[PDB]
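Please annotate this fold before class:
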Amino acid sequence: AMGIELFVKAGIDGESIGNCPDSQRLFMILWLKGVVFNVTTVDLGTHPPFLTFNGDVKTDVNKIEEFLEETLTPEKYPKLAAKHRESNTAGIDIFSKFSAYIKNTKQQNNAALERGLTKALKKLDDYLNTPLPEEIDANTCGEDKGSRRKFLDGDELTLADCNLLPKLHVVKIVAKKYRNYDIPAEMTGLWRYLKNAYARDEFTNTCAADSEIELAYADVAKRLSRS
């Protein structure tokens, strides 16, 4: 861990964190590992974020994630992988559903696309509200016999969170700005998940500005013009 330089996307200001979920993903991982590293916002354009370890460039985001978990190990660094297989697949279809929802221009399809995103969101809400086996044994579940854990896998942030949280945040900001869509408040688990993230510095200080995210989708998202 002698040399760790992280190159994330830069915002319109040229210095701030720009909208790039993959960037926030790796940023959060390094932060949660407690390792010494440097961040440099650069104009990556369409190029993905990357990092250099001891001068050697690392590429991909999934491959970079595997390297960091395999290199920064106990006892000096905490293992950040999720213990439950289900935690790594919750909400995987959300971003895809959201993108098709906000990229649509025909009003005749809006309703269906919206239900698509909502259903994807409810599945994620369901997992977060269903107590994990540990909580059931521990009797760590609420009076509603409902899960009250803070994140996907448990009460500690994991690689699954570093991957999902940035996309989920983007979905919330953009879908609201360009469709006036709100993640229903009845999805108590999902909202409790999001609020917990906003309380942790590792997500807050690695997060792009609401205006930055919105401006980023100004061309991507389309207005429901055609019937």
User: Anything to note?
Assistant: The domain at 4-71 is CATH 3.40.30.10 (Glutaredoxin). Residues 8 and 49 are 5 Å apart (CA to CA). The first strand starts at residue 4 and ends at 9. The beta strands are 4-9, 38-42, 50-53, 56-58.
